[PDB]
């Protein structure tokens, strides 16, 4: 469960703000899906729908 | 210890008094000192029994007999005894304490109570008997040196520097110069006016030596009166020549490495009979017999569990 993560990490092909913002979204959602604690894994569907939810659970 | 011409006692927080040998570096005999530490040792001029000033008791152990209990336990004091003097005749004994009350104790008399008292304002840090056996120099924490005359009681108070605790002060056997030491780390030398019957004893300030950066702890002239050892909390025992007041040799026990904090304070300085050697106690639990001219550790004394605050040295035949 660290293959899609390594794609998000070593992309670095972002030449704008929304490009990195898109990178962030992919990074956050991959961490939720991965996350061992199911209380976080359960919130993955909402985070896809709502960006603020992803940022509140980022840390 | 007693039969041996040279004496070298040692004592600290470990409640022992270890009598070493200068020629070898071997502990000949220890002596127990319970209920307190030892703040200052002192061999008697008669050399029959050593003294050990501690907390609320001036004890005096036997030098001849081995493993004895304290012969004398002068009680009736408080707040420690910083130092102890001894009259060369062997009759009178002087002390100084933090109770702001100098005293005199008659060893010959069996009376527990002392004989004379010279109360002062601030705690007494150091005693020093004048070689003429008539004047007693007395430092204090406020800075005021005094000269309590033993015949006229005319104390001539004097403050070299305001609001600095003078920690020790010594006067050479020839009564030429008198040195004092304070918590700033200066070494105020005073030229003694030549008065005995007149007892003028005027102190002429000669030189303020900037001896150390940090607290200085003891100064003492040699029997030659050519050298003035001055110990401090900077882990260096500097030796100043009496003539020029210059640093002939600096004996340091530093680590030689910036990563070493508070290795141990140096407060021991006892010259040899001929100013060839110099004894030195340190808080690193180790006595050190240094060489004066060269500056080399001749012998090292070890075996003390705790720090070593006192020294004794006696080459009196």
């Amino acid at each position: 469960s660290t293959i899609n993560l390594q794609k998000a990490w070593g992309a670095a092909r972002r030449v704008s703000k929304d490009d990195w913002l898109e990178w962030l979204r992919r990074l956050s959602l991959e961490l939720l899906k991965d996350s061992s604690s199911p209380s976080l894994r359960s919130c993955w569907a909402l985070a896809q729908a709502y960006n603020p939810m992803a940022r509140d659970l980022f840390n | 210890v007693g039969s041996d011409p040279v004496i070298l006692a040692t004592a600290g927080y470990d409640h022992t008094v270890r009598f070493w040998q200068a020629h070898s570096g071997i502990c000949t005999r220890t002596v127990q000192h319970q209920d307190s530490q030892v703040n200052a040792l002192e061999v008697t001029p008669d050399r029959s029994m050593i003294a050990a000033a501690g907390y609320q008791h001036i004890r005096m152990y036997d030098l001849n007999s081995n493993n004895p209990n304290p012969i004398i336990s002068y009680d009736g004091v408080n707040k420690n005894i910083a130092s102890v003097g001894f009259h060369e005749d062997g009759r009178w004994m002087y002390t100084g304490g933090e109770d702001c009350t100098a005293r005199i104790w008659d060893l010959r008399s069996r009376n527990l109570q002392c004989q004379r008292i010279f109360q002062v304002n601030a705690p007494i840090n150091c005693v020093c008997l004048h070689p003429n056996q008539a004047e007693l120099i007395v430092g204090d924490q406020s800075g005021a040196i005094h000269i309590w005359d033993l015949k006229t009681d005319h104390n001539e108070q004097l403050i070299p520097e305001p609001e600095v605790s003078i920690t020790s002060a010594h006067i050479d056997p020839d009564a030429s110069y008198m040195a004092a030491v304070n918590s700033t780390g200066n070494c105020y030398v005073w030229n003694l006016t030549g008065g005995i019957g007149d007892e003028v004893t005027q102190l002429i300030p000669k030189t303020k030596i900037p001896a150390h950066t940090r607290y200085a702890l003891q100064c003492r002239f040699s029997p030659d009166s050519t050298l003035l050892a001055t110990c401090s909390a900077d882990q260096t025992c500097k030796i100043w020549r009496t003539s020029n007041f210059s640093l002939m040799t600096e004996l340091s026990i530093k680590s030689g490495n910036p990563g070493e904090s508070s290795r141990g304070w140096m407060w021991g300085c006892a010259f040899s009979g001929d100013s060839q050697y110099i004894v030195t106690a340190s808080s690193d639990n180790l006595a050190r017999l240094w060489c004066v001219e060269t500056g080399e550790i001749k012998r090292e004394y070890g075996g003390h569990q705790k720090a070593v605050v006192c020294l004794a040295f006696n080459d009196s035949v």
Binding site: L40, C43, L46, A49, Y50, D56, N59 | -
Partner: protein, 59 residues
């Protein structure tokens, strides 16, 4: 318009910052708990914010 909005801040003067002051938990959550408790607590807190208001209707 921006020009006027400045010209009006000019005429009204420059207020002293003090004079204007008179005129006018997520990290704490983690600071306390262990991580196995923290994860439910932080999930709930993030869900409660969505629960209030009309944002809940969408999600």
């Amino acid at each position: 318009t921006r020009r006027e909005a400045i010209r009006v801040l000019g005429l009204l003067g420059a207020l002293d910052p003090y004079k204007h002051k008179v005129n006018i938990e997520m990290l704490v959550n983690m600071g306390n708990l262990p991580l196995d408790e923290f994860y439910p607590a932080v999930s709930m807190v993030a869900l409660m914010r969505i629960f209030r208001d009309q944002s809940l209707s969408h999600h």
